């Protein structure tokens, strides 16, 4: 396999660091995938009664 | 036998409002650049925070 972890970067790109420099140094290992885990949280909620 | 003559006169005033869109905001803004490079097609995203 050229992409062992299943992510958009190949084994050589991950192992040589030849990728985005904002990617954690964990993901420079061909076995750990480069993978974002994004969530959303609500701070408050405003109601505009249109009478 | 009676005959009546009448003459009225009135004047009304009203004031309505919608409590969901009861005003409009207009913010005068200005962009600043304190870097080493120019930026073309500057597109800022701003918050409008109140209380």
Describe this entry's structure for a reader.
The structure is cut from a larger assembly and holds two copies of chain A (51 residues). In chain A, 10% of the residues lie in helices and 0% in strands. Chain A is low in regular secondary structure and 51 residues long. Chain A binds chain B through residues 48-51, and chain B through 18-21. Chain B: This is Iota toxin component Ib. Chain B: It comes from Clostridium perfringens.
Short description:
Chain A is mostly loops. The first copy, chain A, has one helix at residues 11-15. The relative contact order of chain A is 0.22.
Radius of gyration of CA atoms of chain A, rounded to a whole number: 19 Å
Strand content of chain A: under 5%
Annotation, overall tally of beta strands of chain A: 0
Number of helices of chain A: 1
Name the structural class of chain A: little secondary structure
Which shape of chain A, going by the Cα principal axes? Answer: rod-shaped
What pair of chains forms the biggest interface? A-B, 4 and 4 residues
What sequence of helices (H) and strands (E) makes up the elements of chain A? Answer: H
């Amino acid at each position: 396999e050229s992409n062992t972890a299943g992510d958009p970067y190949t084994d050589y790109q991950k192992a040589s660091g030849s990728i985005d420099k904002a990617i954690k140094l964990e993901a420079r290992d061909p076995l750990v995938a480069a993978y974002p885990v994004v969530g959303v949280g609500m701070e408050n909620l405003i109601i505009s009664t249109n009478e | 036998t009676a005959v009546q003559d009448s003459n009225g006169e009135s004047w009304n005033t009203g004031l309505s409002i919608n409590k969901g869109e009861s005003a409009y905001i207009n913010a005068n803004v200005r962009y600043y650049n304190t870097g080493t490079a120019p930026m073309y097609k500057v597109t800022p995203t701003t918050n409008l925070v109140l209380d």
